[PDB]
Amino acid sequence: EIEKLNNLQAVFTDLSSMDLIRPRVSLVCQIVRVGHMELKEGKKHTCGLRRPFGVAVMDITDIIHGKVDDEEKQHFIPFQQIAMETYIRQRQLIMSPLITSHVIGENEPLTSVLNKVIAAKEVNHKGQGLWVSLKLLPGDLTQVQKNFSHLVDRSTAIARKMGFPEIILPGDVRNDIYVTLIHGEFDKGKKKTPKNVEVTMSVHDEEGKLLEKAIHPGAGYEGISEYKSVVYYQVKQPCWYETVKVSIAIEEVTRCHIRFTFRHRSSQETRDKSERAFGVAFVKLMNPDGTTLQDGRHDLVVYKGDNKKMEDAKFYLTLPGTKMEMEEKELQASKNLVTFTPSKDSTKDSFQIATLICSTKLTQNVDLLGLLNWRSNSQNIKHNLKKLMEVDGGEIVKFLQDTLDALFNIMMEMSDSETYDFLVFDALVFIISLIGDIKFQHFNPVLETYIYKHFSATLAYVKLSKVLNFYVANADDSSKTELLFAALKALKYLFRFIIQSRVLYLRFYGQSKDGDEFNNSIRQLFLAFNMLMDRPLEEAVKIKGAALK
């Protein structure tokens, strides 16, 4: 890219406070050669094949620390090539040749050379490297492009962090799905020469049509229809560890899946293009529970058989894709012997991928979704509520609005179950406690936005007052101590919601008929607090402290 030659300016965004104070950060530049399979002259070879060449690494933690910052410094990061050690030491072996092995100078995965460079602080570059001026610019992409616009114009490349910052801004709309090709064990089949498996991933829809540009190889480069993995030479289980970026329409990702067509890229072009994907794995970006694909490792399974069945969405999508999917179908078949016939096409071949979904809207939780489906999952609402608190606030904050509305709906529809009242009470206590945390304190404006604009209850406040009055009435309960104490920790917003429900009652029924009863509840709550405090201090020293707080 001649246009990039003077515009090869990289900026990594989202680099949070804990990122800078990380003990070790290294600037790893992976150099992958693209072209022919074998570095030989004489035979025509396929173009566009990626092969491992080398990786340049420099520990830029102190640069990220900001200890030394200077544009003039053109850091020459030494380049480490893979050990192609088969041409120098062979010329001197006399009087005792007894050796049986093969030639392996490229077959090492890039993670191997990466770990070598990480361990060995010295790199024998032999005059090969790259010049860069590394400086840390405070702030995210915006103020970097505004307080350092000269260095970082809009034409400067944009790169984001593997993770999330300490301050999740409300409306951090993103769809950064980072797919890492950890490894894949693909059998050599009837070829003694190990297959040069290339993961030409293909985002097909539920109808099987390939999605274009949904796969982005990395920052500073646009999306592509299909991403081809590095074609490892005669490696039975290639280990790529190649991260690609997937940014599909966040509302289309439910109908979108990735089809992993594994093609053996032989030493010759006619063989390569005459060889189809002997095996194909895949994953669908939604879980069966209506949630998007969970963040972490997914153990794909490479199928075998009719390639027509491999490429037709109505079959391979319906067929299980991951090893967990093998287990799911097998276990559902164990109880029900109704037309569940396992296929001998299920070879031992399998694939491994990791999905770092950096997104805001995408849902990954079971009990939270069941609570979303409360109107049809009242049976699990007991368990959905019993397990919602272990759901991290990162998931809750995604649709806190619908969560709050659903809790209030549970309250109005079937308020008879005081058990669900208690569950919703404690879950809401935890909700407000986590929103008050520094992580989610900036959603508190959005929380109050919901309260003033989207709160949807008229008498739940009555039951909240009743339950909280019970909480203060049973303050001496050790099991209540943590529950009542955490309620105390956020009583301001609990009562903001209660006031919202009361005022909705007011403006929906005109006059406060139970205004006197309401105030009586308030007063009896005060005197219950009095009963709490006049109890011996030893039981609840810290609890009366938080009460005063």
Curated annotation (Swiss-Prot):
It comes from the Eukaryota. Residues 174-358 form the C2 DOCK-type domain. It is found in: Cytoplasm; Cell membrane; Cell projection, Podosome. The modification Phosphoserine is found at residue 96. The modification N6-acetyllysine is found at residue 549. Disulfide bonds: none annotated. Belongs to the DOCK family. The DOCKER domain may mediate some GEF activity. Guanine nucleotide exchange factor (GEF) for Rho and Rac. GEF proteins activate small GTPases by exchanging bound GDP for free GTP. Along with DOCK1, mediates CRK/CRKL regulation of epithelial and endothelial cell spreading and migration on type IV collagen. Interacts with CRK and CRKL. Interacts (via N-terminus) with tensin TNS3 (via N-terminus); the interaction increases DOCK5 guanine nucleotide exchange activity towards Rac. Interacts with ELMO1. This is Dedicator of cytokinesis protein 5. It comes from Homo sapiens (Human). The lineage of its organism: Eukaryota, Metazoa, Chordata, Craniata, Vertebrata. The chain holds residues 270 to 818 of 1870 of the full protein.
